[model samples]
Target: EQYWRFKLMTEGGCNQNEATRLITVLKRKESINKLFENDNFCNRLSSYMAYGFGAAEEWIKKQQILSNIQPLTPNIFGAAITFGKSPVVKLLKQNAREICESILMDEPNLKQVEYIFRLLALQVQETYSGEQAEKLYECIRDKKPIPSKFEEILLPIVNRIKENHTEILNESKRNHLGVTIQLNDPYSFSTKNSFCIWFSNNPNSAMPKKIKDILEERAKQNAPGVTKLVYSRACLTKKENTNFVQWAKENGITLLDFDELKCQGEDLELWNLAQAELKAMREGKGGNPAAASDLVRWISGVIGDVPIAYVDADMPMLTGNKSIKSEEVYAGHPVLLNMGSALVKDGVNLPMENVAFNTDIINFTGECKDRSIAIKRIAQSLIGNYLHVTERISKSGNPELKRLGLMPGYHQLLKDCEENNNKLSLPMLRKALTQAHSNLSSYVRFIGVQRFAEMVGAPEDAPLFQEALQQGNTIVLTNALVAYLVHGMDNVSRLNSSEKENLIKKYLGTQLSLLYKPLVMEFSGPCAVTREILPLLPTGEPTRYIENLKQPDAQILRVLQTHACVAGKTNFTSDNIPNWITSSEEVERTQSLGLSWMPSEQARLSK
Candidate 1:
């Protein structure tokens, strides 16, 4: 009955009702001898009850009732030694040597042996004199062929006591030690230290030999303080395949498990947000509104009143920080490092796409609700243009340049042309555009279109540009040129097709007339021409017109040259063609000719 009470209390998580029932049943018993006589009950009862509710003294009092009937077993003794107070623990310690001798003679199973030894070690340390503790530990060490599992668990505990006992006795170390290797699910690299290397692959995979070598070399050169290498928890699955662990141990490398490291409060939240963004992109949902809204809030919180500086240069090359600097300079203004490079010479450049900010800055920004919207806007524009142009190219059937419109590599080709100071012939441009298309296609294949679009900051409705500017029967660069011109004048978002055409004629008439000389000549007068002929001229014709000057084309070229001379002196760099042609003389010349040529000189300068 006592045995049943103990088992139910300790192992079964006893409640008040069960405890009262146990007491009542035990009180009704004449003797507990029958229960104690059972070897199984006697062996496991004390150990089981050691973990029960109430004070150690209360447990000891209840356990004392059975002490008179059964001889002390190793399991019971071990539990009492581990869980009892000094007096109760010392009572068990009195028979420690006898218990050890019995355990050695019995040649118990590995688990039983482990429990006995572990109990003896704890008993001696907790209740016995130092000499007794030392002797017991020595006896344990002298035992032959200690199980590897036992040693793995016991050796550290024993060594810790032998050295600075206080250090081993400290609870903080034990509590925190396991934290370093446990929580790596949604991982991100932290750059709090001087240098950090992050491995995103599973630990069982082959180690990055080159990166390891580089780290070793850097360490040898005394590059910085300890360089931290953080890896995923998956890498630590098997000791045999844990090359990274072995290498780090042997090479004096600082190895970190992604789960164990301490991070900023919001780093995990941001990581989760990024993952959400990626997932949304994969599912072809376009932008994650949740992410977008959260990011905007985050940005707003960090950049309170600082003026932003829109620097149009390669930030890495210019500042050597690798991160774009955007922050508050004064009480109310923040500087935003809007790094830019030339379209042809420097190619399209984006910030926060490849490089990240300082860990502190990221944390600060991550904690906020409003975030930077520049990248989103740029993505919207780039994707809108890319989709618009790609569709145009697809329908144009100019096979040489058919798929080249939105190719990412074209940016590189343009940069190459600029570097070489080479003028791109039409055929060369077409060939480069084709190569760019292949490159973009390959990239899109690996990363789904939605993901690719998100990476580039494309909007959800990017593909819905069915009413985008179009040439005679297809979309072309001329359509883009006209769209830009119209967008600069009024709310392009609200403009209809006819409105766009009217604005184009109001701004680019002479340039259009000169460009479509055949069509213009086909009509009786310039007034007879329409928007169909105006925007269909190839984007590359301005240079051709300048190169081969004829009557109207020549006259139109002079007027455009004059307009360019006047517009270049103004501060308005946006696509406001009509605004630039506000001068009376320019207006008069455009009227008599029945064509406005505002964009021609601007186009020339752009090229």
Candidate 2:
């Protein structure tokens, strides 16, 4: 036992500190301990030393103890094979394989032993021949299923050893970039797993030398292991670009559309099948109209399964200023803010793309039409309302509304509303609008509202409020304002009607009355209008009508009539009832008549 301990310390690369600790723990100076008395201890010490811990000689010496342990246990052999010197590893490889096979034969149900077998098989693949490794893997797999954890670790290495490139490609077929690239040029090819470039230049015109040169350069570089190109069949149909197609073909470029590419992989097989089913439904081929309707409804349930195109570039956004440069500004997700170089479909911001003018449509009909008018109009309303509310709150000196702006998710919410064609509830819209106000407040604090307005190119002063009107552009700022006003009507009463109206007029200028009219009407309930129209004009000493009127006025007369009827009498002696009624019945009657007359109950009752 002492000899074995000495060998462990000196030959097994056990450091003085570790050796001392081991000696202290295993200090029972009794009998020659069984070789496997502390199999775990031996294995752990072997691993620590062999892998790393100071001198290379010490590591090698520790590795020798793994071989010295006779009638080798699975634990001892497994550790040495995993982290031992080349000679030690070579000695234990066959023995480890034998031990694993015996363990499997004895207790096939033991998962720990099965794990050890798998480790042995991996070592065999690395050290011995792939053929031997395959036989062992087959033996274990045929007897029982390989655990998923082990399978994942071993399959890739085995495939590489066997030179199975097809299997490797199939394993990595899923589109991870969350985009679809539609190749529109025959010369183009994807250099990435998911995204690729496309072109939209005229087929009749000569291929641009710059683009041609870029493709030529890309082909020469031929970046390893990246499948970056996919070509459109449309490229082959263009008669003018025959030379370009031929050149690309000769240079090993393949032309195929998204559908053709999708058919090659099982990952996209379901999408293709569903698309075909939808096509059949549209053409009235396979099912009744009702069945087709059901299918259409079901498709929406699986909308998330359908991946959206992150970006669609014809030519490239890189070349033009009008293109989507920052994802922060133009969120590219189709379900969110989908904006391309020349096309803007659905989003919160105004379409910054160059609008395509159909000259033929205008010339033939002798009438020009702007396609963006509807979008612009909707944007204007949104901005107008947004400006109205923010200005309303800021003027009231509410500290909470001071630094508020639109939250990031508000854009996504707007896009979602647009895509679904669903109108948000007033409260929901208000919450989003309030977020916008908070966002604007922060913007104002960073750079005063005037500067912010100028930065956004507001035409006049008080840019946050006046810019929307001047530009007639409903942007993020304007949209936020619209959301606030539509949702924040309750907050509107914070300012008096006159104050609010003046602020609106001051900022909105000529458009004040038009914009202010709705707000005025909203505030024009009986209370607001009377205050504005019937200001107290030289009434002596601001006396209440109830106090000064010796005779019952209209209000008092009505209350007396109501109370007299409720008291089981049809007539009151006069509208001038003494202010001494203290009954609950009289109070109810007075309230129902809408009179602000309440008798002092205690004083009336005592009298």
Which candidate leads the pack in TM-score?
1
Per-residue alpha-carbon lDDT of candidate 1 for residues 247-347, written as tens digits (9 for 90 to 100): 87777666655444333434334333333432432333321222222222222212222221111111111222442233211110011111111111100
Using all chains and alpha carbons, the TM-scores for the candidates as numbered come to 0.20, 0.17
Which candidate wins on lDDT? Answer: 1
- Please provide, for model 2 over 1-607, each residue's C-alpha lDDT reduced to its tens digit, 9 standing for 90 to 100: 2234533553345656665555543432222233323344355556556765543334334454432443335123223334334343433333434443432224223333333333444454454346644544443334343333544554454444223211212212211112211112111111111122332223343234565555454344333312123323332336755765676566544322322433223223323333333343233232111111111111111211222111111122222343222221111111211111122211111111111111000000001122122112222332233235433433422222232223233345556777998643222333343233333443233334454454334425454444543454434443333334435445554656466545433333322122222222212111122222222122211111121112222222222222211111101011212123222233244353301100112112213
Cα lDDT, model 2, residue 73: 50
Q: Residue 393's C-alpha lDDT in candidate 1? A: 38
Which sections of candidate 2 miss by over 4 Å? 1-210, 223-228, 234-244, 250-252, 262-266, 269-607
The global C-alpha lDDT for each of the candidates, from Candidate 1 onward, is 0.32, 0.31
